[PDB]
Design a protein around this ligand. Structure first.
Ligand SMILES: OC[C@H]1O[C@@H](O[C@@H]2[C@@H](O)[C@H](O)[C@@H](CO)O[C@@H]2O)[C@H](O)[C@@H](O)[C@@H]1O
Ligand SMILES: OC[C@H]1O[C@@H](O[C@@H]2[C@@H](O)[C@H](O)[C@@H](CO)O[C@H]2O)[C@H](O)[C@@H](O)[C@@H]1O
Ligand code: CL
Ligand code: CL
Length: 401
């Protein structure tokens, strides 16, 4: 019904991840998987957006559009290309990104880990191997020159619940996803990423640089059909809630939401045949983030919430505007209800490599895969303008009360 001004210092921006935009990330586990014999990965990442060279243009564009914040990742595979050999070259590359954000009036949120790992880290047995926790923490300590000045927010591990899910697949040797919901996570990896996270928090806080640290959650918005509450709770806990519980002592927690999955007495039910879908196959559900935020609050307590990824894969930008109008309304609504939300970062700043395909275009900013030309979409112009306005618009539908 009425507009909700940004809280003071509210993050307003977009998010990317190194492997999805940078191009030539050739020391990652993913680079190997993309080219392995028998890979199921539909297409290779290759040059992606070449943000390795073109992040200056990325950030010029974001700032010009009126965004005030940029979440990007720094890449362990580059920083530690072989075990024990830290690249000062790549550390400086990443420090230049932080400084470059600041010089363009963008507050940088730094993700230290976004799914990919060094191939050597995978080859030695991944998150569940002996020493994996110490290895991650050492990498985190080594990022100190990148994050010790000018960075207010660090994300340790992006969506550890997706890590645990995929480890569950790899352990069973499963290649396909169920028609709804998520594969049983590997509880071993669950434990390992949680211990890795706490150790990373210690490392960042040890810098005594005031950094707010936490991690981000792939919120599924599991909804119980009436009667199926207990099944829904059991299903969601290892997939989501256990990672939110591990964040209860953190300085902030990231909410990443896109769609919803209904759960019946037998478990996850797929979207109806006739309901609107996005280019990811997911049900179009603009109000997801609303439920994601509220569920996250219920579980995590009073840890500040930030939306660190939210959007839609679509070829129709006016449908993206629709999606954000509903998502922003849910953010406003949660704020007005008194949730402590301190930022909104859209997924994604650019069209990017969506873990195996380039067809699932999530970008505010269009990318030509041949020339690397950036073209802001209209959604980008509108959302960006809110960085100056600093007020969340509402949809024209009525609230209760
Ligand atoms: O791969 C099957 C199953 O493994 C699960 O992990 C188990 C682990 O918790 C247990 O300690 C040991 C005991 O030998 O067995 C398994 O490794 C994992 O959580 C599931 O995702 C997998 O489906
Ligand atoms: O897919 C768009 C972006 O979203 C993230 O990962 C999502 C996750 O949020 C969601 O729960 C699952 C559904 O099974 O899909 C993943 O792709 C990542 O932050 C981004 O890398 C990803 O591109
Ligand atoms: Cl090196
Ligand atoms: Cl990384």
């Amino acid at each position: 019904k009425t507009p909700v001004p940004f809280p003071e210092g509210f993050l307003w921006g977009a998010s990317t991840a190194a492997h999805q935009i940078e191009g030539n990330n050739t020391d990652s586990d993913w680079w190997v998987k993309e080219h392995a014999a028998g890979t199921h990965i539909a297409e290779p990442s290759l040059d992606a957006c070449d943000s390795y060279h073109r992040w200056p243009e990325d950030m010029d564009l974001l700032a010009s559009l009126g965004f005030t914040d940029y979440r990007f990742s720094v890449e362990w595979a580059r920083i530690e290309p072989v075990e024990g050999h830290f690249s000062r070259a790549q550390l400086a590359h990443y420090r230049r990104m932080v400084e470059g954000a600041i010089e363009r009036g963008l507050r940088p949120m730094v993700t230290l880990h976004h799914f990919t790992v060094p191939q050597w880290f995978e080859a030695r047995g991944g998150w569940t191997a002996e020493g994996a926790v110490e290895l991650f923490a050492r990498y985190v300590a080594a990022c100190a020159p990148v994050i010790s000045e000018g960075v207010s927010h660090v994300c340790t591990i992006n969506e550890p619940n997706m890590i645990a899910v995929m480890a569950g697949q790899a352990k069973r040797g499963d290649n396909s996803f169920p028609p709804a919901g998520l594969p049983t996570p590997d509880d071993e990896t669950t434990a390992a990423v949680i211990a890795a996270h706490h150790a990373a928090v210690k490392e960042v806080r040890a810098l005594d640089a005031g950094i707010q640290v936490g991690w981000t959650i792939a919120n599924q918005v599991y909804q119980a059909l009436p009667g199926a509450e207990d099944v829904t709770a059991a299903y969601r806990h290892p997939r989501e809630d256990v990672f939110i519980e591990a964040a209860r002592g953190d300085d902030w927690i990231g909410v990443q939401s896109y769609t919803r999955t209904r759960i019946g007495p037998e478990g996850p039910i797929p979207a109806a045949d006739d309901v609107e879908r996005t280019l990811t196959t997911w049900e179009y559900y603009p109000t997801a983030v609303g439920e994601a935020l509220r569920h996250t609050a219920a579980v995590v307590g009073d840890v500040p919430l930030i939306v660190t990824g939210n959007g839609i894969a679509t070829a129709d930008d006016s449908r993206r505007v629709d999606y954000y109008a509903g998502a922003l309304d849910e953010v406003a609504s949660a704020l007005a209800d008194g949730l402590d939300i301190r930022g909104y970062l859209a997924w994604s700043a650019l069209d990017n490599y969506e873990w195996g395909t380039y067809k699932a275009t999530f970008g505010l900013i269009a990318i030509d895969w041949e020339t690397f030309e950036r073209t802001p979409r209209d959604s980008a112009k509108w959302l960006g303008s809110l960085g100056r306005t600093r007020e969340l618009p509402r949809t024209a539908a009525l609230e209760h009360h």
